């Protein structure tokens with residue numbers, strides 16, 4: 304079925320400034336969105352901030368300022384940071400938005416009408432910092448900031464406290480079998496596979512019911528009132544998850560401002576999300592709670608949840624590192640170095656090794672070679688002569704690359720897509736070295752035509768596929784290659800030979816380098 308490809312990041316708590324973790328999750332969301340745009344699809348990419356709850360309200364109290372002002376100031380910080388990181392996100396959502404609250408109330412009301420909400424009690428541990436309910440098995444002994452003995456979450460290491468409250472309870476226990484059916488019937492719905500196995504293990508053990516409201520005093524009245532009961536507030540996480548449904552129902556003007564909430568999500572053709580990007584820290588909320596809420600309400604479920612390895616004396620500032628090494632380079636590094644296990648070396652030394660090694664030497668040198676006046680004497684795509692077997696071995700690698708990369712982008716596993724494209728770039732370099740086109744200018748012009756054509760076309764296709772990762776630099780490369788705009792996107796242009804011979808290269812500049820090398824100081 305044809306619809307808008309809907310890709311989301313988590314909405315981030317605004318208790319503190321944005322940092323690398325927030326940027327990384329939103330980068331992944333951005334890359335996925337961008338790849339689907341390049342394929343010619345309609346996309347709606349969504350990020351935002353999670354502004355209610357006890358965590359945020361008590362952070363605003365520490366700063367001695369009103370939650371309203373505090374949340375707006377920090378959300379400002381997020382917005383500015385994401386603008387400066389040069390994403391292409393379609394909307395930024397805030398849970399303090401009035402339309403969002405309307406949607407939270409309608410959803411809540413559906414759960415109640417369905418019979419899946421009753422008045423009960425929660426008596427147990429709670430992590431305010433994770434806004435998470437924990438069983439006694441998930442807490443251990445530790446210290447607080449006053450050095451006194453306390454209890455801490457096994458999940459996150461954060462301080463836990465005992466909560467004994469009359470709360471509205473959601474009948475999560477009744478969604479065990481349907482969730483198990485869903486995981487089993489859609490074995491790609493949670494990525495990577497080992498996190499899918501975790502979720503199934505947990506749900507197999509049994510599910511308790513879930514507190515979805517809290518007494519208003521505990522939350523400092525900084526939350527959404529429960530419809531029909533002003534003494535209770537809606538659980539920050541039920542509120543937070545609904546943002547995906549709210550975003551799917553907002554009409555957004557050119558300015559990026561919400562101008563309307565539609566009654567029915569089908570009108571905008573976004574819901575349910577094709578991909579929810581998250582950190583491992585918030586797996587349970589997205590793979591257990593959220594689909595249970597959707598199942599109760601009669602709403603379609605998401606298609607994929609991808610959980611990366613990060614957690615949503617030493618600092619690594621995203622913008623500070625981008626000014627020094629480059630936005631596109633920094634974004635490449637983050638996506639190249641980081642798998643799903645997240646055992647990443649994020650040092651300056653490794654960043655410089657990849658910039659010099661892969662971007663400068665593998666990609667950059669290749670672009671300069673096939674565009675330089677010394678090799679491409681006529682500043683144009685030449686017409687190839689007959690191909691040798693060695694020529695065709697390379698052409699086949701280039702031909703197969705789009706189908707392979709496409710699969711990786713769709714898992715989604717951006718690291719694997721990047722490695723595959725550089726696998727092909729490495730081969731093109733090896734081919735170029737093998738053919739020494741610098742010599743051929745004299746020896747054999749006809750042969751030089753063939754080699755050059757295959758190289759340009761290899762650089763174009765690899766670059767098209769790397770354009771979601773390197774949005775600005777891909778444009779520079781296409782400019783240099785003289786690739787018309789029509790050919791810079793669309794699945795028609797993954798095909799080998801889409802740019803006809805005779806196409807003229809873009810103009811040159813004296814100092815032009817794509818990625819300049821940096822010393823190993």
Ligand code: MET
Pocket residue numbers: 312313314315316353543544545546585615
């Ligand atoms: C519905 S996503 C909510 C995520 C939460 N605000 C966090 O920062 O982990």
